[PDB]
Amino acid sequence: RSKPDIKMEPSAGRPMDYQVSITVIEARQLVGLNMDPVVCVEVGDDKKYTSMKESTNCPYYNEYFVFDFHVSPDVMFDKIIKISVIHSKNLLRSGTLVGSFKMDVGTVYSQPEHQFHHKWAILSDPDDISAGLKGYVKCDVAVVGEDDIEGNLLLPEGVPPERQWARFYVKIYRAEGLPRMNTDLVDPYVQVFFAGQKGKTSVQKSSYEPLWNEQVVFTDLFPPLCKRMKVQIRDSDKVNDVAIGTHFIDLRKISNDGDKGFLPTLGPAWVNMYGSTRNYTLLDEHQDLNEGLGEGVSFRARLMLGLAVEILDTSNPELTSSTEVQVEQATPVSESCTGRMEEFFLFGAFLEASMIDRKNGDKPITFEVTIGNYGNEVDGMSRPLRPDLASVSSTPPMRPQITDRNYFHLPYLERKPCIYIKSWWPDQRRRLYNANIMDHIADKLEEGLNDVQEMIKTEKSYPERRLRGVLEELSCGCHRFLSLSDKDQGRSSRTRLDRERLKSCMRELESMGQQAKSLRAQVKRHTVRDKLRSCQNFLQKLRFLADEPQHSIPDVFIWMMSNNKRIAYARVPSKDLLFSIVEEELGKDCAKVKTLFLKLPGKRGFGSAGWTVQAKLELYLWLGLSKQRKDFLCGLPCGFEEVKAAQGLGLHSFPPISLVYTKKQAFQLRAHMYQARSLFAADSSGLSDPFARVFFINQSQCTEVLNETLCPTWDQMLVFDNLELYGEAHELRDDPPIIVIEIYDQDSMGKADFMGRTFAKPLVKMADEAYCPPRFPPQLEYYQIYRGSATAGDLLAAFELLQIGPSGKADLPPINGPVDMDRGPIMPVPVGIRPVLSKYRVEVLFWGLRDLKRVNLAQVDRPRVDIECAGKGVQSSLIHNYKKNPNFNTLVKWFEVDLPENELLHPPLNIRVVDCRAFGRYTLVGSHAVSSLRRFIYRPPWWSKYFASIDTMKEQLRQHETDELKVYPKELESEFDSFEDWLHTFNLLRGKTGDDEDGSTEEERIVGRFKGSLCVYKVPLPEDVSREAGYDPTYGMFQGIPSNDPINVLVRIYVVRATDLHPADINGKADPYIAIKLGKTDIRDKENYISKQLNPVFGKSFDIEASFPMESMLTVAVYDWDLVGTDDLIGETKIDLENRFYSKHRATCGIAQTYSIHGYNIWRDPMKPSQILTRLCKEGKVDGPHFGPHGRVRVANRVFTGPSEIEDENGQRKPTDEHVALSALRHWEDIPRVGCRLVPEHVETRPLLNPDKPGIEQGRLELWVDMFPMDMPAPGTPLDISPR
């Protein structure tokens, strides 16, 4: 696989809705006298307080606090939680602070389920090193998108409870390259933030190159729970205090905990921070990028910085007792120790630049390649003289040309402009060289893991030894890094972090080279699927080691301007651009023709401000020293000449300002698009008008618009012709240029609306290659379609890029073009590339549909469902009365349709339901299409036992982490395949698909939910299938299916107890009761609510008739009782008795362990197990039962044995058939054709869900539900499970 995944809108910089929740449970061992504590919780600037507790050292609150944000993930993690015991706070007095505990959101989120539970917050006096410990405050925390103190601390691993105060020195020396503010001078000062404490240097007025040589001194507890420092170059404008740039120092990459690791240190070395545009806009909408809230769009400033964390002894009297952020003159160092100053030379070559927006391509456009302070001559820098060349940094303004209505292209063609920059940077190439080595190893690890996952999920053989070879290559790469990075250990201009961090990666990857060989033995033929997920734990640490805090050279920016106004940008990091003689030290984007996509600056690159590509460039880049420009043209496309400028005429080492091209290979691209599927709904009808517009270099071609479908089959090859590819064959065969496929809805105005985008790489054939298998012809395989943030479709294509031949286009294999003469210029996908189509009969069970939401404050009385698959389709019977009978009057009605032979290439079968209005205007009220037909392909083949079962499920929990009845430790539909044995369930949709800014949510699209079954088989059909359709052609495969007809059904619910219910009251002990909604019937136990109970025991039994299957929709709920207003809601759950009732699993009544009619084991099913087995025999078309003696039975070709006799409550021996009958119920899977499993009498663990707090647990409930139809013999009297 070489197909790219270049997403224009990644997760970085995306803001999401977030919630922080805190319960302040209690406090104990508080140090002091007569304190009356008010616990204060501050997250950011939002501060809340508890209630009043009077004169205690051990208070109890159990109070709740909720805060909500909508910020980017890195913005959240710097925010500080400030739980504090504050003695005697009121509105006029800031109370006397006992102690506090500063600890950020990122440490919460680093916990595996993002929570801390019942843990004691280690409060300490934050403004005194010598003050004692200030007790512990038991609390719990949660961030969502035993009671001993030492066993339950609120700390991560490694942190001692007796934390040591340490001075967190940061040193601010000098800065360079500052932009304009005043009209246009600058007045800088640097402000540092850490754990709410701030410290700023003195302002040096009127200097682009300041030199403070000052430092900011914090005082905080080692190890720091606040995890980043906000270092921010700032301008001291007196009216508007505005920032220039911001870099975050990450504490984990500069440290390793323990004596085996090292204390944190950094620098003194340069730091490259970014922000808004290079010019000073009078109003700057990218001011948030100056604040570091997102990705920086242009380089703002660079700043030498240091870090000198030193641990103090808390009992030392000579130290300063205050923890304030003092301002102190630092100790300056020479700039030679930061790196020997060297000259660097950038090279760039613009080959192609297409896909320019039509709204901006009216005028001649200019590029601008910049690296840091150098290469920005057009903007008029505040640069001094040479610390020289004119620094040609712009392509000439060239008139664009039209590709289509959407996009332009640039007529570079034979002339490719080039840009070369002189720059001066400190030589710190090893920080990016080791990053390149370990990034190459991590890229190989990514490719191996993705190949193993893709090849595992396609079930191609031999996976685990391939994974073992991947980890063997990983071990070889570990040894390669062990040998490579040691070659310049004795460098003199080297910081302490460059020693200790390097030692850390040496130790880690030395261990990793043997952990790979250990997990090589751990990976087997059956454990490969989960050890593959275990393998990327290595990849997490390797990606973490790959990035480094010490910057040397800032990132290379490529810009766009017309009228010298910036419209589009890109930012490639410079670490992949250095040239090195070591292949692992060589950057990934260096000396290679790299595809790169521009995007809009700031917040307007996301969402509805633009979805179109700003530009697509085949940019060549190179970076290195000015003495290393020896062979920097080795990766360029050959067959070219160089045109140079006046400053470097005749010099062999001088780079050209432009190239003129002598080789123009004619290339024809056969773009085979056959199908798209699961697309976005851009039209108001819940469907779209999709067509594929494919871009390749300077031209574009369009397939014809298909109408009113989300799974189009265009079946349309487009032949791009007479295009020009430059260079030789070795730059195209193993790495062709990219293909961008864009999907659009042909709307009512004529102008199309955006639908998505996918990328591709064609299989390349030169004229000397034979068009022979296994390479040619190219097979169809999928391409994931993205519409920016979210996935919005899947496309099927088999692109091949072919040379236009030495004699003509006829040297290519002959095009199997338009045999259908009406197609004309539209031309089909040829045979061999299209799949073989074999006829499959599709059989639909039109069972019914429930749970329609009341759109337009009513319900549709006459719905009818049409199924459409690959053009062909069938329709059900029209509903004559929906509320009386929500079930179609149709048997298994089928249609025969040509389908793809390969099962992975099956199209999504569409299901839609319409209201049958006048004139055949079939207005859609629901539509669901997402299914894979391989699933539907058919080929012929009381307390006394309860507490014992409680001990049993404790054993089941302890074995999972390492009489009687069954206990399921998860939800009942998890064990029993959701009772979807043949009565399948699908979920309908309506409206436009939910874009994050233009559309609704996906829950708002939910309108109905279909019940039915699908059976797919070939029309050349097998022999047992010929028997099955033989008994009834009106049912097909569906023989012996029970009737649809409605019935009154008794609903019998036993509820045992509830556990760990979330209280709404601030005391922490709710007042719950059981509330049951069944169909349209309300039953509440509010008169018998169990007050003041976290784990109440109900023991109530409820019998209530329902109009099944219309009333087969039940919720079992718990309600915190409240007389005033309404009772607070805890949570509900979905039951849906319909899939229980008609299942073969016998969900009507559970079966006990052994047959007994006395005491706590009395057979509660009114129909005895012998009659149960006879019923399952006639319903399962299997002969039986055939009892001999009461201890044995023959059912089909199988024999079951067991006991024979039972005593009643009178103690008299009654021999019945029921014992071996119930034993056969517990061996009912032995039947070779109809065998299955039966539901036993059980108890169940039920998650409760509240839409007030979605996606998280509200408590558990234990219960089990039986039900009985009212034409069978009458149910037994309601049993009682009242507690002891």
Residue numbers in the entry: 251 to 395, 411 to 448, 464 to 667, 695 to 1248, 1323 to 1343, 1401 to 1722
Provide the authors' original text about this structure.
Otoferlin is a Ca2+-sensitive multi-C2 domain protein and belongs to the ancient family of ferlins involved in Ca2+-dependent membrane fusion processes. Thought to be a core component of the SV-tethering and SV-fusion machinery, otoferlin is anchored through a single C-terminal transmembrane helix, cycles with SVs, and hence, it is found on both SVs and the plasma membrane of IHCs. Our structural work used a truncated construct lacking the nonessential N-terminal C2A domain and the C-terminal transmembrane domain of otoferlin (residues 216 to 1931).
An additional layer of complexity arises from the ability of otoferlin to toggle between discrete states in a Ca2+-dependent manner as it engages lipid membranes.
